[PDB]
Design a binder for these strands. Structure first.
Lengths: 299, 110, 130, 299, 96, 100
DNA sequence: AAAAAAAAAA
DNA sequence: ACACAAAATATCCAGATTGGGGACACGGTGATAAACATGGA
DNA sequence: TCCATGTTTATCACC
């Protein structure tokens, strides 16, 4: 009945998502071709895993976890102890086979497929990079003790870059089954996003939100440039939000919420939006998210 | 634009002013005789030596006081000095790099 | 072979079989100089001159200082051929090689200033030296 | 549990860290650049080596005792990485990339996994220019000696820079048996941090901290702009008043810990003004780290 | 056009430099200049990565003779900078 | 799929024609989002302000809200070239279409 | 083992 | 407060030298499924 | 108009 969606960014810092699969002598991260330049990419799977981990952290019932005690990548709690009675975000996972707990029909009458309530998209950078930057070095071996025995004596280097990047996300409103305490925890956890990367012992990137725009009318997405570049701090749709109510009425300004740095840069037009109804200029993103959760589920 | 061409024009004017100060501008005296040509050329290379002095000073002539000496030296002799004067204050730093190129035009030699 | 089989009469002259061929053979079939010159024509979209330039540099290096080199040769080029693939400093090594060295010399300026030539063309033939 | 994280900067002095090995006639320092300006040359793993080195003078067990005997640089090891038998280089029993088996997972159930609980990032300078040399020379003995080095005399120039650069870090960990003493020792040792980026008999440099600031110790990760204070001036006072302001009326805050350099020169009335919650002010970093370790460790 | 002009003008500076400097003697004059580029290249090496500021500094110290109506040559290079160093030292190779 | 979702947000939705069959602008031939309708048909409309009917074929591109708003406002045509939200554009176009 | 020139007005 | 005059010739570095030695990664895996068409009594 | 069935073989040519 009330759909919602937002776009968030973070503070500048050296990159963290180091894929490092190119070859022995290099560590190349994923790249995208945008307007003839190259930009960094972080796949949505990393954010899904991070959200699952934080749902683990907050003492929320779960049906999946890793073990880190196998030769290759493996997950155990996802399918071993669970009848898929209630997933984390009601995902209700699936897998296809000749039979699956008697086709999961008789014991637990659930659809074979899944639900996929949550939606997310790719995270893209804001400014390009310039080739290799950093150097590296590796030790010879275990030396006197014969346990490592790599016999490498190698000398390599990896790739780093400095960039802040943003990504959008969405959430439907008609899904209101077992909502009051499940989804609001997820929305609260959206504010943290600390351990979402491919390595932290040397990079330590944090996805702390800096600005948010998280509202429109109770209809489908208007697509007002969901990948808004933010001009490294600015916002390109100030003109498209001024006319709160007038003859043209070319914009609904009664349903909007603004993040921290977009209000910290005080201006007279900021007061103009403040007197305009529905702006709700805030300063702390976390209490903004709490208020949105209160006014979207309860209200 | 007008900036670069006026810079080149004032550089040429400064070259001609140095030639006039050194000796008479009447170059028909310089030409027409191998000896007159040779002595005029020799005066040209001594002017070139002064040009090397100015250039080697120009590298250490960036910020403040050598800037005063450089603004004392140019012998611009321009028709409408208002525009030339006002146009050079705004571009405080890049004028050094353009005027060293302009002073490279102080090399007529032989 | 599939390329040949109004604008498809002499299309084999370009024969651009670099796109799909290189992407698949990246990981599995990587396990040399057999295919070193293959990508040279694709980079441009001139050859013998660079070969002589590279040969003179190495010969000069050993002159001043005066059976398993094949395996080392294969590994050394692979380290930079792979990085040349990803590029889809480059004026530094050639700067020394030219310094080691004229109508064809004039043509170097017009054949090197292109960005595409700078990005991926000039950094292939010289690798065969060392 | 409580999670803390802090940031430091060092005193200004000439410095050099030759890392590029671009050629023989020159040595370069530059690692990474921002916005068309070459700034940063800190490798985030050398500090780990320095910490490993200074855990010895305080009386802690070690395994990776670096030795220099063979031509190629190498290190040795003790019997086996054991996180519980001793300090384990601060709980750093690491992975074994070999299929030799005989791992303690078969006998001692050691999972070939670590207890990292320590994160950091590379340092970043605050001055772009790096284009100065010294132009020294290396002579040839040729004096009827018993050994010749290169049979030539050469001229070569180094590269120097005069900059003071900052350093962020985070712990966000928890203690176990016999761990609190080791983490207290680590907090004591982080104050000195001498001999970074290897030895230097010609370019003396120290990482003595001034104007250290620690953020949000009790609650979860909520910090912002770890690289904040720069440009040889204080920055976290305005950040303090603009986000999580000391006032408890509109913008709630949390307990902070401030260094000595910031309070050494700053308005006398401002200290009294900045007393709403009392905050935490100190004149020397060492006392601040002692008190912070005592508070965070719970003992 | 631009490449041909800059190649000719770089050859002009190299020829002027060799004229300004001054049978096995021909070899050793050839040999001595083999390392003069090396010591010069390091000197130009210590300049801003963009080299827009530096190329002006490099040529003013570099002795010159003439470069064909200075007005036209200088005014073209402002619009498209950061390209002259691509051949600033390749010209002296052909001098030998 | 749900993740990495893409949505069709209408923008600069513009086309009209006389009570005839499809013709005129081929409904294609647009650049890489820089400036697409202009080189496609706006030059033809300017050259045929009295030949092709601009009274019923109203303006094109919501981008006119950003550059060259006025010049396109008067010297193009006097038709209903309103472009504020595509919703009201579709609404009044539907009203006109159902009128006759 | 190879070279290039003269000039202004309220 | 009037007039007159405001520099001239020689010279602008010479040699010797532009790095040397060792090393350029180690293992584990490279999809899994569902979606028929013709005959003889 | 309407009742029915079937598969079985491994691997190779360059400097």
């Amino acid at each position: 009945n009330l759909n919602l969606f937002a776009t968030i960014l973070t503070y500048p810092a050296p990159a963290s998502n180091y894929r490092g699969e190119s070859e022995e002598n290099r560590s190349v991260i994923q790249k995208i071709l945008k307007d003839g330049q190259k930009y960094a990419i972080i796949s949505p799977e990393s954010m899904r895993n991070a959200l699952r981990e934080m749902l683990i952290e907050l003492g929320q019932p779960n049906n999946r976890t890793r073990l880190h005690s196998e030769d290759q990548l493996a997950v155990e709690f996802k399918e071993y102890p669970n009848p898929d009675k209630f997933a984390d975000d009601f995902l209700f996972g699936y897998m296809v086979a000749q039979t699956n707990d008697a086709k999961e029909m008789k014991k637990l009458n659930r659809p074979a497929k899944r639900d996929s309530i949550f939606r997310c998209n790719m995270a893209v950078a804001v400014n390009p990079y310039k080739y290799d930057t950093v150097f590296y070095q590796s030790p010879l071996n275990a030396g006197d003790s014969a346990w490592k025995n790599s016999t490498s004596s190698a000398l390599l280097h990896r790739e780093v870059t400095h960039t802040a990047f943003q990504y959008p996300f969405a959430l439907a409103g008609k899904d209101c089954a077992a909502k009051p305490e499940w989804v609001k925890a997820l929305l609260q956890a959206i504010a943290e996003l600390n351990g979402v990367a491919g390595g932290h012992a040397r990079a330590y990137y944090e996805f702390a939100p800096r600005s948010v725009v998280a509202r429109l009318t109770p209809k489908l997405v208007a697509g007002y440039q969901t990948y808004g570049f933010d001009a490294e701090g600015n916002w390109l749709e100030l003109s498209r939000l001024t006319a709160t109510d007038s003859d043209n009425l070319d914009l609904p300004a009664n349903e909007f919420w603004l993040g921290g740095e977009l209000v910290r840069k005080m201006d007279q037009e900021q007061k103009a939006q403040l007197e305009a109804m529905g702006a709700h200029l805030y300063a702390n993103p976390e209490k903004l998210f709490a208020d949105l959760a209160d006014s979207f589920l309860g209200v | 634009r007008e900036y670069a061409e006026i810079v080149y024009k004032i550089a040429q004017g400064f070259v001609l002013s140095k030639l006039s100060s050194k000796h008479d501008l009447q170059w028909s005296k310089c030409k027409g005789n191998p000896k007159l040509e040779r002595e005029y050329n020799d005066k040209k290379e001594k002017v070139v030596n002064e040009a090397f002095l100015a250039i080697r000073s120009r590298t250490e002539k960036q910020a403040f006081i050598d800037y005063f000496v450089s603004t004392l030296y140019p012998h611009v002799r321009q028709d409408e000095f208002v525009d030339f004067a006002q146009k050079l204050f705004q571009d405080t730093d890049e004028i050094r790099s353009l005027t060293l190129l302009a002073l490279s035009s102080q090399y007529p030699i032989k | 072979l599939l390329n040949l089989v109004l604008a498809s009469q002499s299309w084999l002259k370009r024969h651009p079989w670099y796109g799909f061929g290189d992407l698949l053979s990246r990981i599995p079939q990587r396990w040399s100089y057999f295919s070193h010159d293959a990508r040279q024509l694709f980079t441009q979209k001139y050859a013998e001159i660079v070969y002589k330039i590279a040969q003179g540099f190495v010969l000069s290096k050993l002159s001043s200082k005066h059976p398993k080199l094949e395996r080392e040769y294969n590994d050394k080029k692979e380290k930079v051929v792979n990085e040349a693939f990803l590029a889809i400093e480059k004026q530094a090594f050639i700067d020394y090689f030219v310094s080691t060295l004229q109508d064809e010399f004039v043509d170097f300026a017009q054949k090197l200033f292109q960005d595409t030539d700078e990005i991926r063309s000039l950094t292939l033939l010289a690798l065969s030296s060392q």
